Amino acid sequence: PQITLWQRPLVTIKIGGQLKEALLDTGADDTVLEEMNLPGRWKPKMIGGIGGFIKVRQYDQILIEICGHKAIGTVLVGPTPVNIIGRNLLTQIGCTLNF
Amino acid sequence: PQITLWQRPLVTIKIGGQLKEALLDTGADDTVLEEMNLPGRWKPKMIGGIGGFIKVRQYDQILIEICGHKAIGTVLVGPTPVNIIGRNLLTQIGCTLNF
Numbered sequence A, B: 001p002q003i004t005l006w007q008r009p010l011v012t013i014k015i016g017g018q019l020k021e022a023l024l025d026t027g028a029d030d031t032v033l034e035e036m037n038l039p040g041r042w043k044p045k046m047i048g049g050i051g052g053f054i055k056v057r058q059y060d061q062i063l064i065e066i067c068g069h070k071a072i073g074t075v076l077v078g079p080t081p082v083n084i085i086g087r088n089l090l091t092q093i094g095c096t097l098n099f
């Protein structure tokens, strides 16, 4: 699709058989989801946002369908109030910025 | 131009006669720049995201040039870790998300 930015770029994603809304975010280097139970072992990560840093748990090789396009990659889980799809999964599904 | 997201989408902006580097950010409603001098009256504002809220100075009707494209809109200035061009100016240069 082509998505204009007059409104927040919110899309449905499917992860773990649940549907969630997520923001398409070119300003996030990684993908961050609200607290959920994901499979396997995690690794620690600190990510910084506008107000400072949060500790998140890194899971790898996670499938997530973003608007019907399957991506498989690293997903961080921690105390974000919005699910953010960042560049790591946006390149997989072939997303670009055009102007 | 077409920008892939293997790397951070950083572009040069021209604002208040200085060239700065800033991130094209689909996940920021607002344009938030590092401490700089801007002419005008401004208003205090609080913006938040990951990590909490920060106080910025709101300046309205600032002309920014983003890669040669002229944009007018609100610019917030303050202790942001990175220069962010948010959706309020990305729509003005005709920026879309495509996949």
Ligand SMILES: CC(C)c1nc(CN(C)C(=O)N[C@H](C(=O)N[C@@H](Cc2ccccc2)C[C@H](O)[C@H](Cc2ccccc2)NC(=O)OCc2cncs2)C(C)C)cs1
Pocket: A008, A025, A026, A027, A028, A029, A030, A031, A032, A047, A048, A049, A050, A051, A080, A081, A082, A084, A086, B025, B026, B027, B028, B029, B030, B031, B032, B047, B048, B049, B050, B081, B082, B084, B086
């Ligand atoms: C409440 C919620 C439902 C929402 N409100 C909003 C409106 N808000 C607040 C914003 O747009 N606020 C912006 C913002 O931080 N947006 C964020 C999404 C968000 C929104 C609300 C709450 C938490 C996260 C998303 C933005 O792309 C920022 C910008 C950025 C990049 C580097 C350093 C600092 C900042 N990205 C991140 O915070 O990325 C964190 C990372 C993830 N992986 C690696 S770093 C500001 C910069 C203005 C959107 S959704």
